[model samples]
Target chain A: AMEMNMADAPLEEGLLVCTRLDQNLCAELISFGSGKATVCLTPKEFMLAEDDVVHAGFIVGAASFAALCALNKKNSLISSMKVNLLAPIEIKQEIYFNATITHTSSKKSTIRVEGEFMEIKVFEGDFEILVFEKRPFKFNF
Target chain B: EGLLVCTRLDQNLCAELISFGSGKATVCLTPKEFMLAEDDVVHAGFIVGAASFAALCALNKKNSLISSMKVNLLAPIEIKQEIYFNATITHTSSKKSTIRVEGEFMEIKVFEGDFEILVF
Candidate 1:
């Protein structure tokens, strides 16, 4: 129960309107406010293979999560990004992401995110997110 | 059964290879509950992850790593929707390769990327 509490509490009420994220399969929102956010991701057994190296997709996903939080809009969608995977992450290793809003307007926001493992830079990205007037998802398949 | 280099991936959580040969690979995925950002909307990262897997499969190089990529998420995905990714090696070198990946859901283009992979 204690471990679950530690895991669930910080995310129980995530920043902005993104309260439904699954931290287990993705990154956890650890800090956020005013166009800046930090997320933490701990690679699970399934996120890797026999090589024990974490997939680049997971790294992209975690950084995107942090970027969305930095945008802090419910209607924000990731439109495009140019990113680099600087290093390989091992299974069970934790990575941290810090995102800042580099640019923003009525229609979009550009975010810069850097991911680190033990203070070593492992990932970096420039994300462009689109903001919509309504919920992007129609809730229909 | 899967390609040799992609042996470590658990397709259930990422993506499954549908076919591959001659610098091309096709992959598919069905977004699960854990992949959601909103109630119904799937996060874009999972889609990128699936595309990454396809890119790696197209290369089929052991000890290969994705060094960089420029990608666009043209559409949003929902839970339980099946997405397909196609990757082709557009350029190759002794130490690096440039792969192009595209993804579709329900026959509509949803994602595309130019990935740079490093072979060590």
Candidate 2:
């Protein structure tokens, strides 16, 4: 089994797992390392709007997922997160996205991510994630 | 005939004319003005915009607003791809018209989807 440091998560592993688990919706991982990650998607899975480049929601989702994986919190659950769309992502193109950890505390962490659609910097945003220590939960009767 | 132009400089007839023919419209998009992706692929939004504009034109109503749209991209659209949008009128009422459009890049079908628009 390949072991990954919480911070230096492999792009291929994280993206490949996401793609496979998400019905192959996510196409590829362009880059991942040093608290930053980038992903690629095909037009078929994007479900883009007319004259709208990339969907902001989708980009945020990918960024959130990457952040979680980077923290090595595979079993934890996210309480809430927010995103903002800065620009449009063109179709059939390879888009590059980066996520950075801005703040980290025992209970919560904040991450900022930016997406580039070709040469245009289409999206720039941030997310807040809650972190929980690994402990088995037991339901009491 | 309603004249419709997109950010890509594509020319299309108004929705009213298309409604006369059961919600069918033709769009002519040149290569240069079209938005291309990183791999030089045509952007899906441009295709959707063209189709949406065509549908609105067929209705012969100015200030038609696009409420929402869902598209299924079937294939890769290359740069300078000669594309055409074939829209089918699904429903039309006093306030909104539902249209389904398909984009063909050369001989291959690149996208198919639906659009909902509000007219004043």
Candidate 3:
């Protein structure tokens, strides 16, 4: 369990791409290498509604943050991002996101991701991370 | 026309939260405690989230499943700064589909993207 508050928690390692008040995601790295990565995030209620659809913001933010964390492992700063919401996700569930770096250069890296629920795609998208020759700072380098 | 909130309209909202209502798809505001920090600049993810939602409002509008969205971060957005969203439709299938979207924020251009949708 997180012993610290969201303000003090070190989310430097993509611990979870959640809001300051909501530690809604418990992300675990499945595997990472060769510009590819996968992680999982658990759902939370603060963002869920009676119909059980998780908030769009939470879904996109989590997927985006997961991609950044994995890509940052082998690259630099992230500049831009693109994502697709294929379907709505449910509350109290574990979601899986997969990202791949399609192209890379000294200045930027192209990434693509897919968020799945029950082995089906709930969301998918791509992001172009702006690279910095020097050490990068933001979510932590 | 109600606020374009993430949760249903029945859900209680914060006093400071802003919404475009159900009009010409648009909404913006400075981040609050729930999604952002006091000094921390807004994240691209949340920005994209809002952008996507605005675009959905322009769809058949929400009867379609959003496929993809892209965002260009022109500048870092911090708390206390007012952010605005204006989404427009460029092209879409007669029966609802991957709608091309263009968005403006802060009275200028902050983000641009599109969405692919399946008829719902």
TM-score of each: 0.90, 0.43, 0.69
Better of 1 and 2 by DockQ: 1
Candidate 2, A48-96: lDDT as tens digits: 4334333332444455455544443332333333334444455676656
Each candidate's B-chain TM-score, in sequence, is: 0.93, 0.74, 0.66
Best by TM-score: 1
> Which tens-of-lDDT digit does each residue in A1-141 have in candidate 3?
453456665434443222332334334556555667787777666555225556566677676665665566432334576666776677667789888888877767788888888898887877777644332233432
Candidate closest to the true structure, highest DockQ: 1
lDDT of 2 by residue, B1-116 (tens): 34432222223211112232445665544433324322333333344445665655544454454555555555544456666767777889958787777767676776676666
DockQ of the candidate models in sequence = 0.65, 0.03, 0.42
lDDT of 1 by residue, A30-69 (tens): 8887889999999887787437678887889899889998
Give candidate 1 misplaced runs (Cα > 4 Å). Answer: A1-14, A136-141
RMSD each, Å: 4.0, 13.7, 6.3
DockQ pick, better of 1 and 3: 1
lDDT of each: 0.84, 0.50, 0.56
What is the Cα-based lDDT of residue B93 in candidate 3?
Answer: 62
Q: State the displacement of the C-alpha of residue A48, model 2, in Å, after optimal TM-score superposition.
A: 2.5
lDDT of candidate 1 over B15-120, digit per residue (tens): 8789987899999988888778777567767888899999988998878888899999887788887899999999999489999999998888888999999888
